[PDB]
Amino acid sequence: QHPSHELLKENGFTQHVYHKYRRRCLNERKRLGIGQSQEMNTLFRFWSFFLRDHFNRKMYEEFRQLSVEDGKEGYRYGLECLFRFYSYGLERKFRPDIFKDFQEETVKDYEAGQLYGLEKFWAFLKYSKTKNMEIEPKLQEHLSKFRRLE
Ligand SMILES: Cn1c[n+]([C@@H]2O[C@H](COP(=O)(O)OP(=O)(O)OP(=O)(O)OC[C@H]3O[C@@H](n4ccc(N)nc4=O)[C@H](O)[C@@H]3O)[C@@H](O)[C@H]2O)c2nc(N)[nH]c(=O)c21
């Protein structure tokens, strides 16, 4: 029924349906204001799921850009979506450039006094089969807090 749900089905993504849906969502974000469009929220959640299995760089960059913007104004649903995309998507297909972004946004989340991102990162490490991942020294320190909860 909802365009996000059509777009998420088996070979259900079409460009004209997505372009229409996106534009309305982004239009309603500007008209009503950040964090005040529920249709925009459906797009954060479409992106979180879609990009796990049909990654596209430009769509990823808008997702990350718009969710980081929302997060600084105080609306964290997009960032929560972003962090799930990182944690579940990098488990499907590891991409070292996306992994570096994941580290950058997690260290930012933690420096803001939040734990949602840091826990998704720890959870990625517990579930992932990727080997010889390079973890930033700063982030390695913050994760060191969860070893005590062992
Ligand atoms: C099996 N599992 C558990 N975790 C992570 O480990 C910690 C403890 O897990 P849980 O207690 O069960 O969730 P919890 O209640 O604590 O918080 P939560 O709200 O659930 O965040 C997670 C949210 O992912 C959404 N969602 C769900 C299903 C799906 N297909 N997509 C989703 O996107 C959904 O919305 C969900 O709620 C949490 O950090 C949790 O994320 C994992 N992480 C990775 N990479 N892979 C995993 O196979 C895995």
Side-chain angles (χ1 to χ4, degrees), residues 1-5 7-9 12-91 93-118 120-125 127-128 130-133 135-140 142-143 146 149:
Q1 208 56 237
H2 188 273
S4 89
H5 172 270
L7 301 159
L8 270 171
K9 306 258 74 160
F13 184 93
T14 69
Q15 201 96 39
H16 65 282
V17 166
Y18 171 70
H19 162 85
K20 207 161 68 224
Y21 165 56
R22 183 191 167 257
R23 172 161 189 97
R24 187 169 82 249
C25 295
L26 290 183
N27 265 2
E28 188 184 276
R29 186 163 176 273
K30 274 286 136 273
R31 171 177 87 88
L32 306 180
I34 289 165
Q36 226 73 15
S37 162
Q38 290 317 313
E39 275 287 304
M40 187 65 222
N41 281 332
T42 75
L43 183 54
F44 282 138
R45 166 208 190 271
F46 166 79
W47 284 333
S48 180
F49 282 115
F50 190 67
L51 286 287
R52 284 175 207 193
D53 296 291
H54 310 85
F55 181 82
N56 170 268
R57 165 137 137 181
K58 254 271 181 163
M59 181 185 285
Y60 162 71
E61 300 189 335
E62 179 161 71
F63 183 23
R64 172 180 188 201
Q65 182 65 66
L66 293 179
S67 73
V68 163
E69 254 172 47
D70 279 31
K72 295 159 64 273
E73 314 234 320
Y75 299 90
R76 288 184 55 80
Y77 181 61
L79 262 180
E80 281 146 25
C81 287
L82 183 69
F83 280 124
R84 289 187 291 262
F85 149 73
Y86 284 141
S87 192
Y88 296 97
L90 284 168
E91 174 176 12
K93 328 150 198 320
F94 185 75
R95 286 163 166 105
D97 56 11
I98 301 293
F99 187 55
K100 281 190 47 113
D101 297 350
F102 188 18
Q103 296 196 60
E104 281 155 37
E105 307 293 346
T106 301
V107 167
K108 260 158 82 184
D109 208 55
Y110 183 93
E111 282 169 326
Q114 305 293 352
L115 284 184
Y116 192 79
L118 194 72
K120 315 258 59 147
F121 197 84
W122 172 264
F124 166 79
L125 300 181
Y127 279 95
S128 162
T130 302
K131 302 286 136 93
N132 325 327
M133 310 209 254
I135 290 306
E136 223 152 50
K138 204 31 199 282
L139 184 48
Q140 220 177 274
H142 302 152
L143 295 164
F146 295 168
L149 314 165

